[PDB]
Amino acid sequence: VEPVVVIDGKGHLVGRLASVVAKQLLNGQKIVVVRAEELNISGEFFRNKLKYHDFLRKATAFNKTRGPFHFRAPSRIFYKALRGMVSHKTARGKAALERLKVFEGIPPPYDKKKRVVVPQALRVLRLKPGRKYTTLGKLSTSVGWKYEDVVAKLEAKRKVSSAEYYAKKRAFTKKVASANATAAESDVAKQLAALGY
Amino acid sequence: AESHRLYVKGKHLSYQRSKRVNNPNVSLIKIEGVATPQDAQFYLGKRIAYVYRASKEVRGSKIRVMWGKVTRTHGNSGVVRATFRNNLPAKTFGASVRIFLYPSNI
Amino acid sequence: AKEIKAERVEDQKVVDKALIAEIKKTPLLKQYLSASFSLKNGDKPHMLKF
Amino acid sequence: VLKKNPLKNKQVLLRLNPYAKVFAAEKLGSKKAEKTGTKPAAVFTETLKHD
Amino acid sequence: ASLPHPKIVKKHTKKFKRHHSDRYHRVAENWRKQKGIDSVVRRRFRGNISQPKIGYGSNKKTKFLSPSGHKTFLVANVKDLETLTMHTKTYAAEIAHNISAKNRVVILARAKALGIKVTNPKGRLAL
Amino acid sequence: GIDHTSKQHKRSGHRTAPKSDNVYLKLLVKLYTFLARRTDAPFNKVVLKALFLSKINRPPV
Amino acid sequence: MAHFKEYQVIGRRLPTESVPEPKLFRMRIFASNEVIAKSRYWYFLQKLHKVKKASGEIVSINQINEAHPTKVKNFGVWVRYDSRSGTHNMYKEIRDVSRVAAVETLYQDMAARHRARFRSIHILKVAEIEKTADVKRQYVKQFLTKDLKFPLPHRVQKSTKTFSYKRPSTFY
RNA sequence: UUUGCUCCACACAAUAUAGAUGGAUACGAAUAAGGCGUCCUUGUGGCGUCGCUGAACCAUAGCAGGCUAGCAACGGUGCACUUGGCGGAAAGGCCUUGGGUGCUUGCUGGCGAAUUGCAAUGUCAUUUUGCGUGGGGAUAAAUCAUUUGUAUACGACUUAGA
RNA sequence: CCCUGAAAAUGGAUGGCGCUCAAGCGUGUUACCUAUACUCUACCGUCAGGGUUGAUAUGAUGCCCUGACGAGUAGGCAGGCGUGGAGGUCAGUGACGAAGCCUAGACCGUAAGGUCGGGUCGAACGGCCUCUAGUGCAGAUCUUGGUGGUAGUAGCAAAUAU
RNA sequence: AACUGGCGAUGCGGGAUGAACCGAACGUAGAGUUAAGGUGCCGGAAUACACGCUCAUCAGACACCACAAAAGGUGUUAGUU
RNA sequence: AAUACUGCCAGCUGGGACUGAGGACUGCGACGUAAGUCAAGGAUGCUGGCAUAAUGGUUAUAUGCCGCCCGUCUUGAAACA
RNA sequence: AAUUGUUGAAAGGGAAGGGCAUUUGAUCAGACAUGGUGUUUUGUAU
Numbered sequence A: 001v002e003p004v005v006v007i008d009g010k011g012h013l014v015g016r017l018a019s020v021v022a023k024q025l026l027n028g029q030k031i032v033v034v035r036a037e038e039l040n041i042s043g044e045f046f047r048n049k050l051k052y053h054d055f056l057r058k059a060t061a062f063n064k065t066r067g068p069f070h071f072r073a074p075s076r077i078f079y080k081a082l083r084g085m086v087s088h089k090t091a092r093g094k095a096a097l098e099r100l101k102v103f104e105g106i107p108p109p110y111d112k113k114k115r116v117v118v119p120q121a122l123r124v125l126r127l128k129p130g131r132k133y134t135t136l137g138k139l140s141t142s143v144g145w146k147y148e149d150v151v152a153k154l155e156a157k158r159k160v161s162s163a164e165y166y167a168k169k170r171a172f173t174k175k176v177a178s179a180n181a182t183a184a185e186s187d188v189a190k191q192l193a194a195l196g197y
Numbered sequence B: 001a002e003s004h005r006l007y008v009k010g011k012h013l014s015y016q017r018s019k020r021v022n023n024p025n026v027s028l029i030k031i032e033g034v035a036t037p038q039d040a041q042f043y044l045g046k047r048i049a050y051v052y053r054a055s056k057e058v059r060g061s062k063i064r065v066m067w068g069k070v071t072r073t074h075g076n077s078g079v080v081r082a083t084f085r086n087n088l089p090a091k092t093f094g095a096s097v098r099i100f101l102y103p104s105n106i
Numbered sequence C: 001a002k003e004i005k006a007e008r009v010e011d012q013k014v015v016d017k018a019l020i021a022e023i024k025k026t027p028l029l030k031q032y033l034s035a036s037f038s039l040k041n042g043d044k045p046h047m048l049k050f
Numbered sequence D: 001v002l003k004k005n006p007l008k009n010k011q012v013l014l015r016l017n018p019y020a021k022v023f024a025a026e027k028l029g030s031k032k033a034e035k036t037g038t039k040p041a042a043v044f045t046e047t048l049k050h051d
Numbered sequence E: 001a002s003l004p005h006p007k008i009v010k011k012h013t014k015k016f017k018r019h020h021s022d023r024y025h026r027v028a029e030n031w032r033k034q035k036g037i038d039s040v041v042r043r044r045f046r047g048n049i050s051q052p053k054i055g056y057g058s059n060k061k062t063k064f065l066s067p068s069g070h071k072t073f074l075v076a077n078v079k080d081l082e083t084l085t086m087h088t089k090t091y092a093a094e095i096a097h098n099i100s101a102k103n104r105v106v107i108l109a110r111a112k113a114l115g116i117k118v119t120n121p122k123g124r125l126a127l
Numbered sequence F: 001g002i003d004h005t006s007k008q009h010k011r012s013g014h015r016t017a018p019k020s021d022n023v024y025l026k027l028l029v030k031l032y033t034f035l036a037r038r039t040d041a042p043f044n045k046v047v048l049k050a051l052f053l054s055k056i057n058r059p060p061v
Numbered sequence G: 001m002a003h004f005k006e007y008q009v010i011g012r013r014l015p016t017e018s019v020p021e022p023k024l025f026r027m028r029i030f031a032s033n034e035v036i037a038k039s040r041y042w043y044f045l046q047k048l049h050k051v052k053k054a055s056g057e058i059v060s061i062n063q064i065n066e067a068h069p070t071k072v073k074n075f076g077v078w079v080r081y082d083s084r085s086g087t088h089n090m091y092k093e094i095r096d097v098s099r100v101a102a103v104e105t106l107y108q109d110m111a112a113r114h115r116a117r118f119r120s121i122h123i124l125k126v127a128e129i130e131k132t133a134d135v136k137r138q139y140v141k142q143f144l145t146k147d148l149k150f151p152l153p154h155r156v157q158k159s160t161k162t163f164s165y166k167r168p169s170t171f172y
Numbered sequence H: 001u002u003u004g005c006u007c008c009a010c011a012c013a014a015u016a017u018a019g020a021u022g023g024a025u026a027c028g029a030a031u032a033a034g035g036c037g038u039c040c041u042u043g044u045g046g047c048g049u050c051g052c053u054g055a056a057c058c059a060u061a062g063c064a065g066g067c068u069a070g071c072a073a074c075g076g077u078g079c080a081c082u083u084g085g086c087g088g089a090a091a092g093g094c095c096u097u098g099g100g101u102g103c104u105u106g107c108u109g110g111c112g113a114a115u116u117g118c119a120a121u122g123u124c125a126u127u128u129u130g131c132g133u134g135g136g137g138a139u140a141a142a143u144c145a146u147u148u149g150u151a152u153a154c155g156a157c158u159u160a161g162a
Numbered sequence I: 001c002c003c004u005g006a007a008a009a010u011g012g013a014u015g016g017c018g019c020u021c022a023a024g025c026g027u028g029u030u031a032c033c034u035a036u037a038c039u040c041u042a043c044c045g046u047c048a049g050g051g052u053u054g055a056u057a058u059g060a061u062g063c064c065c066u067g068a069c070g071a072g073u074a075g076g077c078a079g080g081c082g083u084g085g086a087g088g089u090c091a092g093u094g095a096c097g098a099a100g101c102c103u104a105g106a107c108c109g110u111a112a113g114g115u116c117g118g119g120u121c122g123a124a125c126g127g128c129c130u131c132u133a134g135u136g137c138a139g140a141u142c143u144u145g146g147u148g149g150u151a152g153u154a155g156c157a158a159a160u161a162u
Numbered sequence J: 001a002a003c004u005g006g007c008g009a010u011g012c013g014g015g016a017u018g019a020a021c022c023g024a025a026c027g028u029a030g031a032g033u034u035a036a037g038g039u040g041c042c043g044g045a046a047u048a049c050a051c052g053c054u055c056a057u058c059a060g061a062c063a064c065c066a067c068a069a070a071a072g073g074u075g076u077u078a079g080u081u
Numbered sequence K: 001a002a003u004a005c006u007g008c009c010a011g012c013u014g015g016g017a018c019u020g021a022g023g024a025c026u027g028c029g030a031c032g033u034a035a036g037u038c039a040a041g042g043a044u045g046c047u048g049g050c051a052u053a054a055u056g057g058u059u060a061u062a063u064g065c066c067g068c069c070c071g072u073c074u075u076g077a078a079a080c081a
Numbered sequence L: 001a002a003u004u005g006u007u008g009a010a011a012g013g014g015a016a017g018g019g020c021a022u023u024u025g026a027u028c029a030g031a032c033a034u035g036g037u038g039u040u041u042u043g044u045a046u
Helices: A014-026 A045-056 A074-082 A091-098 A136-143 A148-182 A187-195 B037-043 C006-023 C029-034 D010-015 D020-026 D042-049 E078-084 E101-114 F023-038 F043-051 G034-048 G099-113
Strands: A004-008 A030-034 A040-042 A100-102 A133-135 B007-017 B022-031 B047-053 B063-073 B079-084 B096-100 E071-075 E091-095 G005-013 G025-031 G056-064 G073-083 G086-096 G121-129
Touching (some): A014 A030, A014 A040, A014 A074, A040 A136, A045 A133, A045 A136, A074 A100, A074 A136, B007 B047, B022 B096, B037 B063, B037 B079, B047 B079, C006 C029, E071 E078, E078 E091, E078 E101, E091 E101, G005 G034, G005 G099, G025 G034, G086 G099
Parallel strands (some): A004 A030, E071 E091
Antiparallel strands (some): A040 A133, B007 B022, B007 B096, B063 B079, G005 G025, G073 G121
16 A cells, blocks of 8 residues: 555564564565664563573674674664564565664654554553563663663654644644535535535 | 556465475465455456566567466465466565456456 | 548447437536546455446 | 266256256255144153253 | 377476486486485485476377477488378478488478478578 | 275286287287177187197197 | 253163163253264263163253343352362352353363363253352352443454554543 | 766666555554543643544546636646745755746536557656767876885785975 | 472574464364365376277277276386397488587487487498397496696705805 | 384475374376464464463473473462362 | 254356367257257357467576485484494 | 686575576577469460
8 A cells, every 4th residue: 555654663562563564574565663762572671681681692602793693772673573584594585674674763754754553563452451561772771772862862852843743733634624614514515425425 | 647557456475385385386466455355256367467577678568467367365364366377486576466357247 | 560431430420429418418427438447545446336 | 078067067967867857847855844733742841941 | 281289288398307417527417217225316305306207208199299290200312201292291301410412402302392391401501 | 095905007917918929829819809809609718818828838638 | 162052862771671661861961063962971871870872872862942041140050170180079150141151151261270171071060040149259249239330441453454544542 | 098077958778676556644642541622710621522443534537638718716736936944863855935837627618539450567667877969067096116114924004205 | 370499511492583361371163274185187107897800990919998096125027218249121321421529409208318400520320120249337445547626835944155 | 022003115294303203105287175283474374253371580382302390389260178 | 933053955146266188970868849959978159469589498597485415334324424 | 528718698695506486688499371262374384
């Protein structure tokens, strides 16, 4: 339905988002993941910090620079979730990894474009209320991400830059929802309601 | 009009396969907007063209085509099976195919 | 390497004389026939009644 | 040469079964039974229903 | 033209090359059955080469038939060409490879008069 | 796959033709194969099956 | 087999020249069809009397429908079950419209609570609890109060597409 | 370096496409809560309304979209000029003032379409070069050879030399 | 069910990613996926049962019909392909080019292989029927001859020295 | 050692992987349907439905099989007196 | 009284897929008073395009999945035999 | 023939090689363009 949708990572379970994301890449769809620092993982924070430290212990013994690269960014933690869910060792999976961009915050030009959600991968619609969940920004800061503060600073700039956009968007929406009702109660309006619009 | 589309877009997902064996004779097509096999029953028998581009011209066109048709549904999620005259090249796992509305039944 | 018949034009005319006289008796159908059908974005031919 | 299925292909179904034309005309696969009003006994009914 | 024939199906158009024929130069192109105790070709593992079975045998009506629809007959002189005069619609003449250039034109002229199709009319053309 | 109750593709174990290249014997086989097929009498069947027989199975009388 | 029905299966011994006309044993059997129902009948009749399927005879099998299958009623079910470390009797109340639906609910619950399959469960009795203020389980007793009123918070909604566009709500 | 190089515009040729075939259509936060509208003696407020899927909204009729006569207006939408901004996270895009011009299906007309012959995507897009038109802009470095030793197996490094 | 009990040495394994009203566990209803399995059809081969000569089909181990089958080491049998030579025959081919050899050039055969076209070449060689054997090679730390990678590599550094 | 079935000699689907396990034995193709196993993605197939249990600061995840015991827990859920 | 469920129809009908094998007739049958026709012992009819690299073949490459290096000894070989 | 040189073609992220299927590039045979429903041979076989 769209050449590229931009998926918000806010309130998303990581593996449940990455699985439907990985199916979308292998079905020839370009998708971009923004706000990967607000991704959620089910389980306690100490459970997932110990889970990452178990992963971080795994490195090649004779040479550490060619081993498993334990990436500490939330975008690259999410990228590590995609790998394994995609057949990245073949040229089809390399093309699937080529069509995917995962980002911290919402960088340009994706700040001024429509962010979609995956409702059956959301933490709200999948976790039982009362379970403990870990946000990816807090987890990545504990394991070695050095950029929690600047992504939080740039998101604070982007949030008010988009709040003023929505302020004039409400102004135009108020004007157009007054104008259509002003153009209503006529022959063209009642006929269009009769057909079903 | 700026829209001249008489077909519906579909994605060539993969070959009809087992876990470790694929059969390139019949392919799997995910038609856009279709989610049930009951609503995918409309699309059986309809023609599928994989429309692609080569570099040199053959009959006055760089556009070439592989023709096929939907044979049956495949699964519970609107994926259908398509048999082509010449099979799909397996580089098109995710390319757009065109499911025309002919042969129609309306 | 590589002309319309005058008989083809005239029988098309006398078919059109009968056909137009009932096309115009209902509103907006002449505009409907002069338009061309196309599948838009989001419409699904398995649920669009024609 | 080629086997043709009965219960489709009515000419093969009429090559077999000379009663098939009478069966189709008289609708003997969908015959109405005779209406009767026999009531089950109370001893069978209360055995079925008890406890 | 020939008499009509069934649609030809080769049923394995690919040549049955020998196992490891391109790995080793001492292993020739021609097919030998692998008779080893541990060979995956003889054991017919999935993903390996197919061996010649009788299932791949062509149809009896379309056996020894060219894509022109003819059985090839290797002729050498005009006396061999007289045997295909009444059998033009099945047998196409083929000039033998050791026929001289001055003797090929007399057979080509005779076969063109007799209506016998020649599969190799361009062999040893002097120009 | 089927339960093989016996040996599949088993030859009958009997001679359908003489092993000889005798042209005159094969002419007598040709005549008596016609006689066994076109007569209901089992005499022509017995003579044909005995014409197939080898030298150790045709003793002198 | 949890698309259950309730059957009465009646059976007796084979009639002999010395003792004909046997005692005609009947019992109610919850099974998905008549073949399991006759099998479970001969199972429990071998648990009770010296008779087997060859020495016995099925005289009647009848599907029991509820006279009021659309009335909510408390079902006190006495059940024994074989565990990994022994056998126990127990007694659970199931609030359902049907005696069959209560047995379906117990078979799901006993597999969930004690890992007890259809293999290791014998339904001793299904008694309809006639009144209230006699149920002695709080998970049934809480539904038998005046003017029952409770919400279902945190509604999940079924999505027909992979991507949504509205950040979907959860109100209900 | 057979008057080299780069950038604006155009024709023409390639090879090349992980796959255009109306539209990325932009708040944030919470979900056991929110959005929207309105009001106030402006709040962690009152009232009304909505959701229960985007099956939406915008756009969408015209020889793949021609020619043309008008009707009520002052809109809409390209293409360029231009007033100014905003945006550094990969900004390279978004918004606005005004003029010019093409179209307008908001409404009424008239002409044209065929023969691609009963379908053949029936070709219209998106990248990068390579030959030429006609304008603009710029007018060098590096390596080797010699030399130094803050360096050095050799390369490298680090120097110096019109 | 979960937890403690529960500690091994390269880094690491529900197969991986991950999964928490599960993508865990127990159970149940269906829907769906697909094996060379089952069914149907075609073709190949084998086996079995048959049919086919009062003038007719190239004259019968042929042709045709029906049906069932088809895994395979050691092994057995059968039908064929190929090489050297021999007896016949094609009044066979050939200096207007035989045999050989090369041919990501065609055709036939399930295949063994055969055939053809082009290039080189220069003197003999094939088809069919049959006979004969020093008759088919990928292996034997095979034999002989030749050629590689290693590799322009190790080395050409004792005897004072040019 | 006994009965039987397999591997040897046997490919194919599944058990990620494996001579033996499960299914099923194999001419060459086409179509359909299943078996064993599965349907989040890799990976074809329901992020299906229903009833519950479990939150683990070494969870658990399918037989062969690639491990876990005695004992204890007002952890929690059912139940018996 | 309906309806659910189970079952039957020698009930009708729509949509799809794959196959077209044989080559005078015979045979069984159906409809028709007969004559003949037919879904009755296997596909014909109509139409269009191209007539060549279009389709097909070979070969190379790319892609999807599979594919351990052969011979031998062995119960077992890809073996660090 | 091994092996090598040049040219041409193609490919190349810790192998290459192979099978099923197709794309793309290169290359290659077949029809039918048949004595053919005939049609006065310019002092009667196109």
